[PDB]
Amino acid sequence: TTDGVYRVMTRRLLGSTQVGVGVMQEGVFHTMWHVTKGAALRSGEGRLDPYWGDVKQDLVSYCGPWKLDAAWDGLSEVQLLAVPPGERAKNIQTLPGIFKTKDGDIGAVALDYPAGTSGSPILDKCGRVIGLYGNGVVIKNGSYVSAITQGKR
Amino acid sequence: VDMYIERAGDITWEKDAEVTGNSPRLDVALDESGDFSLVE
Amino acid sequence: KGXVKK
């Protein structure tokens, strides 16, 4: 339950499936709303209950309010710390593009990983989490582009 | 449905990491359910 | 996206 990146798993009567990823920071677990839909999370022996969420931002926090507040500088390369199902964590560096919306520009990464990678953290060069991966769009040729989704602290 | 978490690593930047992906500039809309879509 | 958005 210490700081770090975690897989979000589900199991019924047989094996387990990875449905997402999240970040533990300052005693709060951060992931994307579509990963858990607000369901409680087991962490070893304990139960983590959702504390805050927002379906439109596609974010959820457990144990306390959203803690991640680093922002993409709009200029520099970033790293996705991808935690794909069945694979160990790995870093991919990229220069974001931009989702241009009526309410402003959002950094966006043209990186394509399985659905259960949703919630993987995107990092600045200091290792701070500037957002989570996995809410995005496909373009005409089918390629996937994810927003750099960050909440408010 | 037992949903549970398991630690997967430390959060750090990797020096000399592999670089991939383009930098698309896309016009998009965000609906109230959290879905992004391309503006036609 | 393995799916088209998430």
Gyration radius of chain C's alpha carbons: 4
Q: How buried is residue A54: exposed, middle or buried, by Cβ count under 10 Å (0-12/13-18/19+)?
A: middle
A42 SS3 class: strand
Q: Clarify whether residues A143 and A76 are in a common domain.
A: yes
CB contact under 8 A, A112 and C4: no
Neighbours of chain B (3+ CB pairs under 8 A): A
Report the alpha-carbon distance of residue A36 to residue A70 in Å, rounded.
23
Contact yes or no for A143/C4 (Cβ under 8 A)? no
Q: Which domain holds residue A120?
A: 69-153
Q: How was this structure determined?
A: X-ray
CB contact under 8 A, A136 and C3: no
From chain A, pick out residues whose CB is under 8 angstroms from the CB of C1: 112, 115, 136, 138, 144
Q: Clarify whether residues A57 and A81 are in a common domain.
A: no
Count H helices and E strands in chain C, helices first: 0, 0
Bridge partners, residue A121, by sequence:
A132
Q: Clarify whether residues A15 and A36 are in a common domain.
A: yes
Q: Clarify whether residues A73 and A44 are in a common domain.
A: no
A139 SS3 class: coil
DSSP output for A51-120: EEEETTTTEEEESSS--------SSS-EEEEE--TTS--EEEEE--EEEEETTEEEEEE-----GGGTT-
Question: From the candidates A30, A61, A118, A120, which is the catalytic residue?
Answer: A118
What single DSSP character describes residue A34? H
What single DSSP character describes residue A142? S
Q: Clarify whether residues A97 and A140 are in a common domain.
A: yes
Q: Give the neighbor-by-neighbor strand order of the sheet with A97-101.
A: A136-138, A144-147, A104-109, A97-101, B25-30, B36-38
Total domains in chain A come to: 2
Last residue of a domain, one of A32, A52, A68: A68
